[PDB]
Design a binder for these strands. Structure first.
Lengths: 257, 125, 171
RNA sequence: AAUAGAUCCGUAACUUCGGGAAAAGGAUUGGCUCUGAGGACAUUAAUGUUAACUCAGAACUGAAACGGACAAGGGGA
RNA sequence: AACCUGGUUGAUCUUGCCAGUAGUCAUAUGCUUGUCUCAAAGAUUAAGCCAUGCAAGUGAAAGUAUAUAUAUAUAUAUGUAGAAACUGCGAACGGCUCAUUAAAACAGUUAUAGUCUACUUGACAUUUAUAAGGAUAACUACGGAAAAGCUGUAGCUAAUACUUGCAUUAUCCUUUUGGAUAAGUAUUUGUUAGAAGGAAUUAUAACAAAGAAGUAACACGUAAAGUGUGUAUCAAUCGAGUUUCUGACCUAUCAGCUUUUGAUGUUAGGGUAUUGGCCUAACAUGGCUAUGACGGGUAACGGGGAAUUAGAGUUCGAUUCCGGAGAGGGAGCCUGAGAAAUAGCUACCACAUCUAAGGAAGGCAGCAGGCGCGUAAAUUACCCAAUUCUAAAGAAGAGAGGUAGUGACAAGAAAUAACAAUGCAAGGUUUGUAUUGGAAUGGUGGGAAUUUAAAACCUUCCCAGAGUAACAAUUGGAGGGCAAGUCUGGUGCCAGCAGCCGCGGUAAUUCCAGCUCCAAUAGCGUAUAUUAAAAUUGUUGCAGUUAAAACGCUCGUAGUUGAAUUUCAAAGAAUCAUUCUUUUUAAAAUCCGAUUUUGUUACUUUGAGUAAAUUAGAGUGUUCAAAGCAAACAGUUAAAGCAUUGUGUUUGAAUACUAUAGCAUGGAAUAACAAAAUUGAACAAGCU
RNA sequence: CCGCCCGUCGCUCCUACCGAUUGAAAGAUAUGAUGAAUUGUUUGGACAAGAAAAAUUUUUUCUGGAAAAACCGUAAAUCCUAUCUUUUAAAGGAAGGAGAAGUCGUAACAAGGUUUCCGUAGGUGAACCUGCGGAAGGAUCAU
C-alpha cells in the first residue's frame, strides 16, 4: 500500500525542530492539528529540548496525562500536538505562561508572558467564507473558524482573539503604519512596520517592509503577520526584539564580555 | 541504517614520493622536531594549506567586501588564538606568509622541551 | 484504465510501466432502460455512494419558460445526439430526447392562470398544439448513470424546430 | 481427396528490376428489414419529366451456417 | 602544489603514443598486524532457490463481562480485576531490493477557477421516551479425517455490532409588547439576482421539482456545570491523484513515423473522487519530424550528492534522506478513508511442501541462517533501555530500532624508549657513538570503582608486571625513471626477473641467496575500473605543406556569422595632486512658475520559494584529532541579579548554495524585432 | 652495401569472418485463435423470514437471497504467422596476425643498376611487368 505516511526520519525533520544526528533516526511526526508540520512544533520537543523539562519520550508522556498543561486555556492530551505559530500555553501548578514567537536566528522559542498578556492572543485570518444566512466566518492561521467578524475586517486584516470567550475584540489593518512580522520568509524573525506594498498582476504579492534600524526588505504577502499598529507591538517580543542585528557585528558583541 | 558519523582524512600523500630535495628537507625537519613518521609531517601541511587556501579566497575579494571583512577576522581570531605570529602582524598577507616549522612549534611535544622538563626532544616526546 | 498505454502525440509508442493502480478505477458503464424504479449503489473512493440507475421510468421535468418543475413520467425515447442503437435499445442519457406527458402541465396551467409570478408570457402555438395532442417532447438533462434520476426540461422554440426538422425533405 | 469464383487485405527469398505473384497467408459472401450516395431533359441561386450497379454501416434472423447446384489453382523449401 | 620522467636515433630536434606518477567513500586479493576510537558489510552475478525461528498488534476512569477470583454491613448494593469471544482502530506504517524505466521516472517551477482526503483541531443541524425491536459469538453436548490460522446441527445472552423512533425555530404589521406567515443539509435538475478574487455559471439569496446521511434509545466522573465514543456540514491539518513551464546517456550501418486496431481534433454521451479519446458513436484529415521524429542499445531507478579538480571540465551516484517501482512472472478482485495490497485472496505459467493417494497448504527483493552463482560480502545473538509508530493509548508489542559477535571496507589518535659515565670519531674542553644501572611508562593478569534492559568494551585506584625492555614490524626494491651495492657467493641465454627501456654466453651493481641500505610503516604490495597527468577531445584549449588529417572543383538549403548611422554634454561638495558624489539639456498628456510616465525580448542588478544530510564556514579544548553540537560561569558549599524568605544565569545550533527553467525588479551599453512613402500621418473647422 | 629489405611458397599457434543445416538455440514486439479467473447486468430460486385459513397442515402474495447459466468488459496462460534481439553447434571455406637460422627470386632504398609514385586496365609463381593520363615526394629550380 501507499497510504498517508506516518513516520518522520530524524534527518528529515524540519531544521528549526533541531533534532540531532546520533539521537535516533525517527522524529516525532506531529499529529494532524491546527497548524502545518513544517512551521509548527510538537509538545514533545517543546517540553523536552526547548524547556529541557524532561529527558525521555516516556517521561514526556508521563507529564501530559496529568492535566497540568493548557493551550488557549484548553487542555490537550495529544502528545504530538502542533502548538502553532503563536499561542497561549499554560502549565497550572507552576503558574507560568509561555508564548511561542520567532528569533532573530529564525527559530521557535518559548517566551515568558504574564497572565494579563497571556489573556491576549492574536489571529491572522486566511480567508472569509460566508455561509447560508448571509453570515461570515474567518479562518485563521490557528486553524480556527471564527464566525460573525466585523464587516470592516478583510482577508489580510487580523483580529484580536479573547481565548476564554472565543470572540474577536479589535481589528488591525495592513496600512503603511501596520507593524508586522515575517513568518515563512527567508527573512524570518524580522519585525517591521512595512514601507509599501508592490501588487503584482496575479502572482504572489511581494511587499517591502521597513525595519527599526532603517533597513528595507521584501517578502511575499502570504508570510506576513500583522502583530500591531505603529504605536507598539501588541505582543511582548523576545529578547532580540525582532531586530535583525547583522551577522558581521554579532561577532564583536559576542567577543566583548 | 548508516552511522551518521562524518569522517575525513587528515593527510594527503605527497605524490612523486622520490625527490631527494624534499626528502632531505622533511628529514631535516623531522630531525629538528623529533617526530614519529611521515603521516605527521604530511598532516601539518594539509592543515596549513587548508587555512592558506581559505585565506587566499579572501585575498581575491575586494576591499570593504562584506564577505572579506567577515572571514578576515573570523580566521584572524583563530590565528591570534593559536599564536602563529605576534602583534606586529595584522594583515591577511601576513597570515598568508606562514612556514611549516612555525606550525610545528605549537605541538605539545616540544613546548615542554623548551619549557624544560626534558633535555631532549625524544625525551620530551 | 485511464490515462496511459496510449500513443504519444508525436505518434510514437509509450511502452507501459506503472502497473494499473486503483484510483484510476474505470467502472463498467450502466445502461438505464424503461422498467420499475430500481437502482443500485456503488462505493466510490473516499466512501462516496453513487446512485447507479439501471432502469428508470419517471423523474422531475421542468418547464423553463415558466421556471417551474413537476414530477411526471417518460413513456418513450426517440433520439440522442450520440449513436442510434443507444436510443433504439431505450437508453437514457444527459442530452437524450424523450416523450413527456402533457396532462400534469396542463393542470398546472389551469390552476395557475387558466385558459385552454411572471405570468402572461404568450407561450407558443406549436407547443399548445402538442399539448392538445397530449404528447409533448422533452430533453433529459440529468445524468442517470451518476445521479440515478431522469430530470429533464421541456424543449421549446428554435431548438424544438431544429430537433423536429431533422426527424420530419425528410422520411 | 483437399480451396479453387468474386471483393477487400496481405504477399518472402531471389532477380536479367521486366518478374517471382493467384507467392505464401487471411476475412467476407448465407437470409432478410434497411437506409443512403454517384446521368440526360428548364425557368429568372433555386425548384419539375426521365434512364445505373458500385459502395457502406445498424439490425435482427436461420439448425454457429451458406462462390449453397453447375463451374472452378493445392501450396512451400 | 595550475608539475612531469624513461622509451623510436651513430647522435639531434619534433609529432606521436606506450610505460612510469598520484587520488578514489572503488572493489577484490597476497603478506603482516602490539593498542584504542570509529564502523562498510550478498549491489555488481541469479529481482535465483529457500530448511528453519521471528518480523503487527492493541484494553490502567470510560463498549460488551454469570468462565472466574477477591474485599467492604448484612442471600442484599457496590466494587477491584478478568481467560474466551463480539465490537473498534491499525495492519495501506515501517523494513528491503533496484528488475523494469529514454520526455517515462525524477528535479525545479505552476494549476487543480477540473478532485478526493482517515485520525485531529475550530465552528455548528434539516423533512414506549423515567428509553423500542432482533442477531449471535464464546459456551454446553457428538464427531470427521493425517491436517489446515479447517469445520455441521440442537440450545442461549449482550453491547458504543444491526435496526426503528421521543418537538422547535425563523420572518412580516401596530412600533419592551400581541397577532400572523413560513419551515430539506449536502446532492441533482430548470428559471433570476449576485463580500472576495485574476477571471465565477463564486459565496450566497429567490422561484419550481426530487433528495440520501443526521441532529446521542451510548459509557466514565472534574468544579472547595465535566469527559470519552459516535453524527450532518464548512476550513486547516496529515497527504494523495491529475497538471503547466524547463532540463537527459549513445546510436542515421534508425528518414520519414502515427492513422481501419484512436492516430490529431470537434460534437454528443458514458465512466472517474474530477478534466481529459479514459472509453463509445458520428464528423474532419489531421499530428510529430535533420532544432533528429519514429526505432535500437544502456552491464540506465531519478534527484539533490561522490571522486577529481587552478579554472574549465571528466567519471560515478544499487546503497543514510526525497520521489518511482516491485514483492517468482502477468492479470482480476473484496475490504477499507486510504491497496489493483502479497508475512490479503482469486486464476494461469515455472518451481516446491504434507500425503493414509481422498485431498490441504507456498512465496526471506523483511531479520538471522542455508543452497546455487561469483573475485566478492556478518551471528539461525540480546533487548524495546535509547528514537519513533499502532491500539481500547502508562506497565503491551514492534528482526522498526538500539546493544552485542565477525569484520586490516574505509577514517582518526597513538607503543615497540629516553637518561650518567668512560672508550672511539669529529671540534676548541662541545656533538654522535661498546659497556655498565638504574629511574619512568604502557601492553598484559587480577580485583575494585564507573558503565550498560544485562554483560563486555572505554576511563580511574591498588598489587605483579621490561635490559637481548626475548613484551623482537612488516611490505616492496637496491640499472635508469626512482632513494638505496661494479659488496660477497650459486647458476650461466638455462633458471629467471622485468608496468617501459632492458639484465642473464664466468666479474651478473637487474636471476637465486647472505650482509647492508633504501621508501612507507600497523601498514605495504598485486589486478581491474576511474580521475588528473591529457593543451593525447582542446568552449577556455589541439593539429591538418612534409609527422594523422583541406572534400578534385564549384553551386546551394538547413545551420553559423553578418557595413556604419539615431542624446551630445556642462556646472557644484568631499580623500590624495588626482579620484569620488550631486544637479540640468528637446517634444507629448499630469498637477496653479512648478509639482512627472513616455516600445518588446535577449542580456544584466537586486530580491521572495529557495528540504535536511553532504559541501565551505562560525562558535565550542570529545586528552588533540577523526568527533559531535555542545558547554561555560562563582559556589569545602555562599554572594549577587530578582520576589512581594527562595528562586541559577548566560547561552549556540547562524551563514552562501539549492540549476541554466519560472515570479517581481533597476537598467544608458551591446544585440536582434516592429513601426519607416507603390503613399502614411498629426492638428484645426464643419457633418453624421 | 660482404648494408637494408620485399613477396610467393614451407611449418607451428591464435583471433575474427562466411557457412548448408525448411540452421538450431535462446529470448523480446504486432496478428489471429483458444481462453482460465473475474467486475457489472440479465435469467435464476436450496430457503428464511412476513401477510391468509382451520384449533399439526396447506394455497396465494412481497422482499433478501445460495449453487448455476448468457451477455458485453478487464484479462492471465498456451498455440499460428510476421518482426526484432543474443550465443553457438556447424562439416567446411577463405583470411589476417604472430613465431620461426626454411626455399626461390631482385622488387624498393644510390641514376638500386629499368628514376620512383598515383589512378585505371591487362598479364604474370612471387615480389613484379606493360600501356594510357598524371606528380616530383627527381636524378633538372638554369640560353
Amino acid at each position: 500500500g501507499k497510504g498517508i505516511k506516518k513516520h518522520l526520519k530524524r534527518v528529515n525533520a524540519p531544521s528549526h525542530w533541531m533534532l540531532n544526528k546520533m539521537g535516533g533516526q525517527y522524529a516525532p511526526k506531529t499529529s494532524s492539528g491546527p497548524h502545518k508540520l513544517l512551521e509548527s512544533i510538537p509538545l514533545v520537543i517543546l517540553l523536552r529540548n526547548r524547556l529541557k523539562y524532561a529527558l525521555t519520550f516516556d517521561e514526556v508522556k508521563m507529564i501530559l496525562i496529568q492535566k497540568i498543561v493548557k493551550v488557549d486555556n484548553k487542555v490537550r492530551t495529544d502528545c504530538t500536538f502542533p502548538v502553532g505559530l503563536m499561542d497561549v500555553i499554560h502549565i497550572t501548578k507552576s503558574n507560568e505562561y509561555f508564548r511561542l514567537l520567532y528569533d532573530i536566528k529564525g527559530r521557535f522559542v518559548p517566551h515568558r508572558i504574564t497572565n494579563e498578556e497571556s489573556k491576549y492572543k492574536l489571529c491572522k485570518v486566511k480567508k472569509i467564507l460566508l455561509r447560508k444566512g448571509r453570515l461570515s466566518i474567518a479562518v485563521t492561521h490557528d486553524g480556527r473558524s471564527i464566525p460573525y467578524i466585523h464587516p470592516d475586517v478583510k482577508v489580510n486584516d487580523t483580529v484580536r482573539l479573547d481565548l476564554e470567550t472565543g470572540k474577536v475584540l479589535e481589528h488591525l489593518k495592513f496600512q503603511v503604519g501596520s507593524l508586522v512580522m515575517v513568518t515563512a520568509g527567508h527573512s524570518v524573525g524580522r519585525v517591521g512596520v512595512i514601507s509599501s506594498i508592490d501588487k503584482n498582476m496575479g502572482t504572489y504579492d511581494i511587499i517591502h517592509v521597513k525595519d527599526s534600524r532603517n533597513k528595507v526588505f521584501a517578502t511575499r504577502l502570504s508570510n506576513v503577520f500583522v502583530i500591531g499598529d505603529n504605536t507598539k507591538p501588541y505582543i511582548s517580543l523576545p529578547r532580540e526584539k525582532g531586530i535583525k542585528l547583522d551577522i558581521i557585528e554579532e561577532r564583536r558583541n559576542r567577543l566583548k564580555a | 541504517p548508516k552511522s551518521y558519523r562524518n569522517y575525513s582524512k587528515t593527510a594527503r600523500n605527497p605524490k612523486r614520493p622520490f625527490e631527494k630535495e624534499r626528502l632531505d628537507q622533511e628529514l631535516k625537519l623531522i630531525g629538528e622536531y623529533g617526530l614519529k613518521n611521515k603521516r605527521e609531517i604530511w598532516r601539518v601541511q594539509y592543515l596549513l594549506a587548508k587555512i592558506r587556501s581559505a585565506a587566499r579566497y579572501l585575498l581575491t575579494l575586494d576591499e570593504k567586501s562584506s564577505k572579506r571583512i567577515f572571514q578576515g577576522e573570523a580566521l584572524l581570531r583563530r590565528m591570534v588564538r593559536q599564536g602563529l605570529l605576534g602583534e606586529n602582524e595584522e594583515k591577511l598577507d601576513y597570515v598568508l606568509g606562514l612556514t611549516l616549522p612555525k606550525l610545528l612549534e605549537r605541538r605539545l611535544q616540544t613546548k615542554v622541551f623548551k619549557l624544560g622538563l626534558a633535555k631532549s626532544v625524544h625525551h620530551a616526546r | 484504465r485511464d490515462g496511459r498505454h496510449k500513443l504519444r502525440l508525436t505518434g510514437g509508442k509509450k511502452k507501459i510501466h506503472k502497473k494499473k493502480r486503483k484510483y484510476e478505477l474505470g467502472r463498467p458503464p450502466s445502461n438505464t432502460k424503461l422498467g420499475s424504479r430500481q437502482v443500485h449503489v456503488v462505493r466510490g473512493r473516499g466512501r462516496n455512494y453513487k446512485y447507479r440507475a439501471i432502469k428508470l421510468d419517471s423523474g422531475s421535468f421542468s418547464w423553463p419558460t415558466f421556471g417551474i418543475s413537476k414530477n411526471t413520467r417518460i413513456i418513450d425515447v426517440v433520439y440522442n445526439a450520440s449513436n442510434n442503437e443507444l436510443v433504439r435499445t431505450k437508453t437514457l442519457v444527459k442530452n437524450c430526447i424523450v416523450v413527456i406527458d402533457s396532462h400534469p402541465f396542463t393542470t398546472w396551467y389551469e390552476n395557475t392562470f387558466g385558459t385552454t409570478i411572471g405570468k402572461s408570457k404568450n407561450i407558443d402555438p406549436l407547443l399548445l398544439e402538442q399539448f392538445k395532442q397530449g404528447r409533448v417532447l422533452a430533453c433529459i438533462s440529468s445524468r442517470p448513470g451518476q445521479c440515478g434520476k431522469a430530470d429533464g426540461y421541456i424543449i421549446e422554440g428554435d431548438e424544438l424546430l431544429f430537433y423536429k426538422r431533422k426527424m420530419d425533405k425528410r422520411n
